[PDB]
Structure formats: C-alpha cells, structure tokens
C-alpha cells in the first residue's frame, strides 16, 4: 500500500548558508594570496569613535590564472540541486537531484557585470528577492555570453550589436515581470565609490575600472570602454582602502565572458508606466548567489 514519492524541497537562494560560506572563503583566499602593500581600515570603540588603522605588509606581485573550485558535501550532509526550468530560486522545486559537489566555479570579484559565470539553459532569467522592492538587487543570468576583451592599453572591447541584442532581451524579460506596456530604460550608475560607479573587477590580480556609461544608456561594430588599472582602491572584503604594487610585465590583458549583470530599479512613486534600471553590485555575495542559487545543503535524514 505504501506509495513512491519524489522528495520535494523548498529553496531560498537569498538565505542560503552556502553563499556566506563562499564569501568567507574568497576573503580567505584573498587575505592569503592577494595582500595589499598598505591597508587602511576604521578602528573603533563601542562609543562610536573611530581612528584609521594602518597595516603595512609584504605584497608580492603574482600573475594568477583562475583556479576552478567547487563546494562538496561533508559526511552526514547532502547537497540538493533544483533542476526546474526557469527556476525562480525561491519556493518548492519539482525536479530535485543530489550531488557530491557543486559545478566547477571560476569566482570573480566585480560590479555591474558578472564575469565567467554559469549561463541559463533556456532563455535569459532575472531574479530578485522581491521585484516590488526597488531596494532589492536584480540578478540577471544570460543564456548567451558576450565576450569582453581588455588591454592594458586603457580600454576593453565589446561587440556592439551583441550587447545591443542583450539589452533588448533583458528588457523583454523585465517587461514580463513588470508589464508588457511599460517602457524599459537603462541608465548609468547614480554614483558612489568608484568601484560601484564603474564596471570594476580583478583580472589576473590587477584591478580594472571601466566607464560603463556606453553600456547602460538605452531606449526600448565595437563598443570601446575607457578603462584604467588602479593601485589605490576601496576594499570589497571590508570598509577601507588598499594599495597594491604596480603591474609587472606591462601590456596587461584580460578576456572574459559577460554571463550576468546586477541591476537596480529606480524607486518610482511617479506614475508613468516606465521603469528605469541601472548597474548595481558591491556586496560580492550577490555574485556568489548567481552561481549557488540552485543549491541547498541538507542533513542526511
């Protein structure tokens, strides 16, 4: 009389311990493999007053290639994987499977654009903890990579027609979420630290900062972005500034596949049937969610 059933499971990519674990790991890797020559951070006392802490340490310049990694299940635990089409990242999952480790990941610290991540299987998918809340970041997962090549020459190359198509398809998806009649518009960052305002990322150990204005000025050949390599930066790991050594060889290069984006929607009390979206990012945890959203670890019961 007993009946066979698939173990259903509810997921929440926005409250997934794995994302925090990864965050702490990348920070570990950096703290041990990419140390700044000088680090400035606020040193405070419970009262609220702060002073700048200064850390000077050996900062060997290392040319690094991406080391693929993955997260695996410890004894007594299991990693569940949601296999549903267009999975929202939240709620019950119909087709679930189990795995020993997650897929191979080539983590990348960056803003605005997600580089070298996983592509969506079907069409472009967009996810947010709550679309109605404009303060919640929108994670865009592309189904087609747009190659972006940079050179120490001070600029990165991006196919224009390719990116134009991308913006349109993303717009379409946003319309599927907010209304087929609303007008979709992309605008540059409203501002903030350089890291937040530009499309920044670390490639081969160097810190790139690119003007992404061209990238997000759209209405519903090559696109050359003015980029720059910086030695003095604001840290993503914690509040503070860091200084690293200058580039070695010279004529720095980088080739990456734009596989996602982090967007923000302008709070709109203004009734006009139009939605505006700008480049987002900053908290690197959203970068980790883009890769870990379909996994959930559970106790073997």
């Amino acid at each position: 009389e007993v009946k066979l059933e698939n173990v259903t499971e509810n997921f929440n990519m926005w409250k997934n311990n794995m994302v925090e674990q990864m965050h702490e790991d990348i920070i570990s890797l950096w703290d041990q493999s990419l140390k700044p020559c000088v680090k400035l951070t606020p040193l405070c006392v419970g009262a609220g007053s702060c002073n700048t802490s200064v850390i000077t340490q050996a900062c060997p310049k290392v040319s690094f290639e991406p080391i693929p990694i993955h997260y695996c299940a410890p004894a007594g635990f299991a990693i569940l994987k949601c296999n549903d089409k267009k999975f929202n990242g939240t709620g019950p999952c119909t087709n679930v499977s189990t795995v020993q480790c997650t897929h191979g990941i080539r983590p990348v610290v960056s803003t605005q654009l997600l580089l070298n991540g996983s592509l969506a299987e079907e069409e472009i998918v967009i996810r947010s903890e709550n679309f109605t809340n404009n303060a919640k970041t929108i994670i865009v997962q592309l189904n087609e990579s747009v190659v972006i090549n940079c050179t120490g020459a001070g600029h990165c190359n991006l196919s224009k027609t390719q990116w134009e198509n991308t913006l349109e398809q993303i717009a379409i998806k946003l319309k599927e979420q907010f209304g087929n009649n609303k007008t979709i518009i992309f605008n540059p960052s409203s501002g903030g630290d350089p890291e937040i305002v530009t499309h920044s990322f670390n490639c081969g150990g160097e810190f790139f900062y690119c003007n992404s204005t061209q990238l997000f000025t759209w209405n519903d050949r090559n696109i050359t972005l003015p980029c720059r390599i910086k030695q003095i930066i604001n840290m993503w790991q914690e509040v503070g500034k860091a200084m690293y050594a200058p580039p070695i060889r010279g004529q720095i290069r980088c080739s990456s596949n734009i596989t996602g984006l982090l967007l923000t929607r302008d709070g709109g009390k203004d009734t006009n049937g139009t939605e505006i979206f700008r480049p987002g990012g900053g908290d690197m945890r959203d970068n980790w969610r883009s890769e870990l959203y379909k996994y959930k670890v559970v106790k073997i019961e």
């Epitope: 020559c37 000088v38 400035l40 200064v54 000077t56 340490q57 050996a58 900062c59 350089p194 900062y209 720059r228 390599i229 910086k230 030695q231 003095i232 930066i233 500034k241 200084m243 050594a245 200058p246």
Partner: antibody, heavy 128, light 110 residues
C-alpha cells in the same frame, strides 16, 4: 620638474624636539611621495622615512623608534619632519627629497623608492 | 636589515680615464638600486635608478649595471665635475626600510 625649499638652520637643546619644513612647488603635490634623509657631519646618508602623500601614511627607519613623525599639508604643499627627545648625536644636515608617483588622484601609483628632487638641506645642531 | 656595502672606500683616477664603482647588498634587492652623486656643501643628485636607468639630465658617460646583490657604476671618461662622493641606495624591501651604502669617494690621481 619641481622645487623643494626647506626652513632655516636650527640650534636645539638636548631632550627637545625640532620640526623641519619643506615646501614643494611646480606640480601636483599629492602626485609625489616625500622622503627625509640625514647626514651627520663627515658621514654618509641615512634614510629616516618616507610619506605616501595621497594616503597620508608614513613609514620610518626602525632605529627612529617613535621619535620621528613625517607629515604633509596638502593645503600648502608642505612636508614636515619632527624628531623628538633630541640627543647631541642627532646633529646633522637634514634633507627633504621627493619623486613623482604618477596619477595618484586617479588611483595610479608607482610607489617609487628613489629620490629625484632634493631640498637644499637644513642643519640641526643639538647641544647644551 | 639590508646592508649596502661600497668599494673601494676611496678610488684614485686620472681625469679622462674610466672608473668603476662597486656596491653590494647583503641580500637580493632585484633592481631597486639607485646611485647618487654628492659634492661637499651640496645635496645629493640622482644619477641612476632601477639599477640601469639613467635619470634625466645625467650625461651618457654614467651607466649603471647589475642586479640581485651585485651592482656597478661606470663612468667611461672622468671629467672635472665627476670627482665627488657616490652613494648607492636599495629600495626593494617592503615594509620599507631603505638604506644607503657608506659611499665611495672619487679622487684625482696626480
């Protein structure tokens, strides 16, 4: 392509402190890092410390344990050197020097340790 | 920490002749090695940095050479203005504890 001009000679009493000034002109102040060097009479050069102007962070020679402080005033393109609890053997000529680091205001920095531009030096005599 | 040693302490050379100055680090300093010239009553003047790069304004007779812990300053043809004291300086360690050699005085042989 600058000019470093230092303050006048000083006569100090043992146990007191001195503050030598160095005014920089000719280019963007924050694009330079400045160093202080001392030369006791008849001796060689001795590195005392260097300040990364844009970061307002200074590093020092170990043997000047907490007695030396190098500061910069971006408002007046002036660098200062303070040496406390002076001893007669602190007597010497103090040189201010500097080198271009690049577009520091844009986040670029060579972090050069050599010294291209030099002040004229300031003699400090410590004696009772 | 890192000790810079220069030799000879004093070098006597006839004007017009060549001169080779030596500087040794107590350990590798890669190429962060500079050479300075100083006349009495004057401020040091930069000659070479990066072990082999001549500073702007310095005559071509001044050439730097070497890497690691062995460096050399050569002056192909000594002129009246070259007779002075020469100092090498390493600036490769970090945290920074830069250091100078105790100098080599170049004197006129007569």
């Amino acid at each position: 392509e600058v000019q470093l001009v230092e303050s006048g000679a000083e006569v100090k009493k043992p146990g007191s402190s001195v503050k030598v000034s160095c005014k920089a002109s000719g280019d963007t102040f924050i694009r330079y890092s400045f160093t202080w060097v001392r030369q006791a009479p008849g001796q060689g050069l001795e590195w005392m410390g260097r300040i990364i102007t844009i970061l307002d962070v200074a590093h020092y020679a170990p043997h000047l344990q907490g007695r030396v402080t190098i500061t910069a005033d971006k408002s007046t393109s002036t660098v200062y050197l303070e040496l406390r609890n002076l001893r007669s053997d602190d007597t010497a000529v103090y040189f201010c020097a500097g080198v271009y680091e690049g577009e520091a205001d844009e986040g670029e920095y060579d972090n050069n340790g050599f010294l291209k531009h030099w002040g004229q030096g300031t003699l400090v005599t410590v004696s009772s | 920490d890192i000790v810079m040693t220069q030799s000879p302490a004093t070098l006597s050379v006839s004007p017009g002749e060549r001169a080779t100055l030596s500087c040794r680090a107590s350990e590798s300093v890669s190429s962060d090695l500079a050479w300075y010239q100083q006349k009495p009553g004057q401020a040091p003047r930069l000659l070479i940095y990066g072990a082999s790069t001549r500073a702007t304004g310095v005559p071509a007779r001044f050439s730097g050479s070497g890497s690691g812990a062995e460096f050399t300053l050569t002056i192909s043809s000594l002129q009246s203005e070259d007779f002075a004291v020469y100092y090498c300086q390493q600036y490769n360690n970090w945290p920074p504890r830069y250091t100078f050699g105790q100098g080599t005085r170049l004197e006129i042989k007569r």
